[PDB]
Amino acid sequence: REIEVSEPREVGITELVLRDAHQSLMATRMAMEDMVGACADIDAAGYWSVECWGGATYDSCIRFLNEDPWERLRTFRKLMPNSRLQMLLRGQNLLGYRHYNDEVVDRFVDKSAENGMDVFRVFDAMNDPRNMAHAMAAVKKAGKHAQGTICYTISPVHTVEGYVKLAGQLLDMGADSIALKDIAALLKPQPAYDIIKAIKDTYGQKTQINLHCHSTTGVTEVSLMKAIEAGVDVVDTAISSMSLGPGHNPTESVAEMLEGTGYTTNLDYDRLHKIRDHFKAIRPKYKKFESKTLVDTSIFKSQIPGGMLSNMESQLRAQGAEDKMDEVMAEVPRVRKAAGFPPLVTPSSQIVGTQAVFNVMMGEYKRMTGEFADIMLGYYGASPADRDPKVVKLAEEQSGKKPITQRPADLLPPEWEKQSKEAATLKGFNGTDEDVLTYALFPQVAPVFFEHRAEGPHSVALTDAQLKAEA
Amino acid sequence: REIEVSEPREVGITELVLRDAHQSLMATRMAMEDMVGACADIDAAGYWSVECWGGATYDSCIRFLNEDPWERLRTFRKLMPNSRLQMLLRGQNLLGYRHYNDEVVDRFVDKSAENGMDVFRVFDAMNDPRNMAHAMAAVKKAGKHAQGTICYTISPVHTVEGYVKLAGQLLDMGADSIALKDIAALLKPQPAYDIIKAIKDTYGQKTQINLHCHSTTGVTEVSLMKAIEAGVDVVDTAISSMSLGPGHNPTESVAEMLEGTGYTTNLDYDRLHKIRDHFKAIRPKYKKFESKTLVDTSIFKSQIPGGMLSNMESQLRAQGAEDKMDEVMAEVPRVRKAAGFPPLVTPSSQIVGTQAVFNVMMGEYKRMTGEFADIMLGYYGASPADRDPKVVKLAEEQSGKKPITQRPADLLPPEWEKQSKEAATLKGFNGTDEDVLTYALFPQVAPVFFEHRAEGPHSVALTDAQLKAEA
Ligand SMILES: [Co+2]
Ligand SMILES: [Co+2]
């Protein structure tokens, strides 16, 4: 047999240690003083982009580190002046708990670019191209790199056709590149290869594509090799001393494997070696936050992310009937289908999970949560497939809400001023739109943070004194 | 571009959890009671072979577990009756500290087969086909599967040509299959592919080849994918809950990645799931023996295995001048070349290491160890390349020994009876050739073990009581 592979070329690499790595391995608890020491080396490493913001870091900065995310960004911008900063943004949900009016989005993106962010990976938990439409436009306006995301998953209705169709929409709404986000490491080799190849084949070699695979299942570094053969443009990795497990593949490993393949990743190996040693010395101080598993191929059978899994397990233990776990494992599939097969990521995974528990407890949809009902009624957006009209009807009947199918942000009122007004009454507020955004995104935290921020950022990691006095 | 790949087929898998996995991750300290519970499942998993003996397990059984290796084998043979048992045997060195007369070898192999071993992976630390010649013959005589090994490494004189030449010798001395042993995870993708393809191309598709890659560097699972494309016959893996790090790639991961590639590994996924959960519950009791690194691509620059590295680091600290480490790192290359570029594995790595320290300390070869001199004089066998005649001369001059170049076992006297005689005087001896072999292999331990063996095997792992009282 013959396998057509892409021509010899440089592959781009995106380092994730400053954001997704620690968010995935140590609950986003990584402190800023523990990171800044590797910025210079990271800046000189030779990465295509450096993901250092977005995701749960915004929340973890104000909720657990008494740190100002905007200060973290302004510092990274200053310490890595030659690098393309990158961040994760959940579209019309920004980094918040709900959707927001376009005003908010415009201001957020506006302030993010103004403070130095270069690449914005905009994504949506249900893959609704509409919820990414505005953010994408806000980034293009700001003259920044827009990156439309596709949340990869395995389901009866997800196919290469379906992902190419999605790639066309991301592009049509003016995406400067397409990012394939595989957070559960469900992206197998052949599929990774075909999907990448199909996109490039349909829209053209010029179509820029970035592959973001985690290594929870342990098969994605091979997918990264295939992806590169299909001709992918960039692949995300994490410095070896902060990889594997629910983390990602190792940068040095991924750069080393290419030797002699005709492909190459122009990265300074010595720079990388310094970065590795850096976090290798810091990582033990975060053991109270490490996950205890390195490989888990279970989701290939269950389709249930381990995180989601336990989140229900303990959810059942609280009712002692936590022995029906086996029944729940069988209910999820059925609940997901009812919801139109949405990727199982936050919040779809936690929503679908809980609802699956109620069903295995109080009968099939005899009771639904506010969220589940809102997902069935379409207040989060359109599902990859059609939702069980039966259940949709029931939702509207149980809650009392109106079933909608248009961008959930269309029927949202201007809320900026209102946010500004309320934020200008919290002790500690500084008057910037930044502090306003923090209140609009985290209304429950903004108060306590604004009052303590003057104390300076802290850390919840063990001190070198504690590592000692223990081991 | 086009890449020729092998036709669709089943790939064989060899589980290593019962031997190499725990030897690599927890210093061979795994206890037998902690393992037997997974034997039934492992037997029904569907593996090509199950490595459950050889390596340092023979030593660790008598030196730390007060267990009889032959009893361990007879039990595995009994608990996994449908499986092909496999073991690692360092040729004319068997599992001992020195070479032995052919008698010993014949008796050892004879007793190993008699007790149930089916596949013998015979290998040699310097790749001298002669030191494997007799063992290989002993296995064929015993009607068992002989597996000639090639220790893969990266050096100025190691090439695909060189490995094919070696493959021809292994075959010529009647090898039923060729095993490519990469213990430092130096086997990159393209090389793994070319080497496998070359062998198959030269000697034929029928030539059976088994790939044994560790994952210390983090690039070998990709090599395993390529190897399979080049048409490899079997690949070694370790149950996911006992993988990565200085360990190996995960069995479930490796079996899962093939989906849709036209290749497949007929393994019972549920059986595998039980095996995984088994060792996942047992593995924490061995934390006092776990390695603290998961990925390390340093040997690609240094060519110095991390194990060898630290083994010198601490070797220098004992002299306070442990700051010349940088000079040692530069000396090794030079010492290896002098020795003819031997793979850096036990004992070549520890020998070459020490000698490299003396050089960086007492001047270039101003003093040599007994071993280094014996390696230069050829008492371990022939090197992959020629040894610096300069240094060879110096060796013979420093020690006083005669320089030889023929199989070091040719000039060895019959020693069985002598061993039997001496072993029949140790309290606890049972009179079997087995107990005699133990004395011949471990003369320093056989005494203490024979006196305590009646106490039954023990464990040096934390007790479920200790895990608790700690965490
Ligand atoms: Co991620
Ligand atoms: Co091994």
UniProtKB/Swiss-Prot annotation, chains A, B:
Substrate binds at residues 19-23, 56, 181. Lys-181 is carboxylated in the free enzyme and helps to coordinate the cobalt ion. Lys-181 is partially carboxylated in the complex with pyruvate, but is not carboxylated in the oxaloacetate-bound form. It catalyses: (S)-methylmalonyl-CoA + pyruvate = propanoyl-CoA + oxaloacetate. Residues 11-273 form the Pyruvate carboxyltransferase domain. One of its GO terms (molecular function) is metal ion binding. InterPro entries: Aldolase_TIM, Carboxylase_cons_dom, PCB-like, PYR_CT. The modification N6-carboxylysine is found at residue 181. It is an enzyme of class 2 (transferase). Its cofactor is Co(2+). Co(2+) binds at residues 20, 181, 212, 214. This is Methylmalonyl-CoA carboxyltransferase 5S subunit. It comes from the Bacteria. Homodimer. Transcarboxylase is composed of three subunits: 1.3S, 5S, and 12S. The core of the enzyme is composed of six 12S subunits. On each side of the core there are three pairs of 5S subunits. Each 5S dimer is attached to the core by two 1.3S subunits. Thus the total number of chains is 30 (6 + 12 + 12). GO terms for biological process: gluconeogenesis. Its EC number is 2.1.3.1.
